Amino acid sequence: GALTLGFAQVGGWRTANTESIKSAAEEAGVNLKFADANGEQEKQISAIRSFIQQGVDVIAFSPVVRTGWDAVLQETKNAGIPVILTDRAVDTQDTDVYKTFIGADFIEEGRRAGQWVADQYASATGPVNIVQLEGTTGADPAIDRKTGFAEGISKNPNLKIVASQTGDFTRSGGKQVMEAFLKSTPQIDVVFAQNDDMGLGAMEAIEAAGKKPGTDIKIVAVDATHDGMQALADGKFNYIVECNPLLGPELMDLAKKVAAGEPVPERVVTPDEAFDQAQAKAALPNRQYKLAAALEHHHHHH
Ligand SMILES: [Zn+2]
Ligand SMILES: [Zn+2]
Ligand SMILES: [Zn+2]
Ligand SMILES: [Zn+2]
Ligand SMILES: [Zn+2]
Ligand SMILES: [Zn+2]
Ligand SMILES: [Zn+2]
Ligand SMILES: [Zn+2]
Ligand SMILES: [Zn+2]
Ligand SMILES: [Zn+2]
């Protein structure tokens, strides 16, 4: 009587990865059945139907698209199998077709980035000119991080976004746009980079212009990646924020709750990360050791 969890993976932006889900199920004693939709909704819908046929206790999936799940979700509800959504939220026209959604909040990321700018410059004695390197036009995290950042700086009107342009989430995109900003904007105090790569690009443009990233022009970015954190530890970025994807254990814990009929909230929040330079300098070199210790304990499951 191990709980059986069917999980239909996609094949996106802040997505729980397979190793995390597989390892968390081993740790929780959950019998995990994986399916791969290969980017395609009809194949995810088939995987869900096959889990219903296999009589799993709980079905979770990471929706490849927001819409068009109501029919298959009626089939799960009719089979009495609870459903948990991960990573991407759905649009539904029905009531109570899934138990809970677990995923990252991109508006919150932008907001925390904005709020750090507001905090750091609460006493600025001159205007604070912010330039923004946006993600790919129309991408959900790009739209939301922009919305969030605007909210985070909204209580201090000395903070002004004086230029905002897509760098398409890439290093070369961020570098190219920052060059343009340096040409068009005589006074830049802060860059808000909606991901680490664009921030790293920007840092190189700032350096090529003979300026000092992190001191002359401060950089606040999203994504606590190795290279982002390395820049921050080197004092070339000033602040990083991240809203995590699903980690794994909370999914396993929720799966147990919903299989037992315990009511759960319709949304469960993921954890967050944030680092200034001092915090990155402590955390970064250590990560390899914490990772290795954890992998060692876990390998006894294999
Ligand atoms: Zn494992
Ligand atoms: Zn264990
Ligand atoms: Zn309907
Ligand atoms: Zn969104
Ligand atoms: Zn990256
Ligand atoms: Zn968060
Ligand atoms: Zn600190
Ligand atoms: Zn151990
Ligand atoms: Zn051991
Ligand atoms: Zn192993």
From TrEMBL:
GO cellular component, one term: cell envelope
Binding site for Zn(2+) 7: 140, 144
An MF annotation (GO) of this entry: metal ion binding
Alphabetical list of PROSITE patterns matching this protein: PROKAR_LIPOPROTEIN
Positions of Zn(2+) 11 binding: 242, 273
Binding site for Zn(2+) 1: 19
Entry similarity comment: Belongs to the bacterial solute-binding protein 2 family.
Protein name from the UniProt record: ABC transporter periplasmic-binding protein YtfQ
Provenance organism: Mycolicibacterium smegmatis (strain ATCC 700084 / mc(2)155) (Mycobacterium smegmatis)
Lineage: Bacteria, Bacillati, Actinomycetota, Actinomycetes, Mycobacteriales
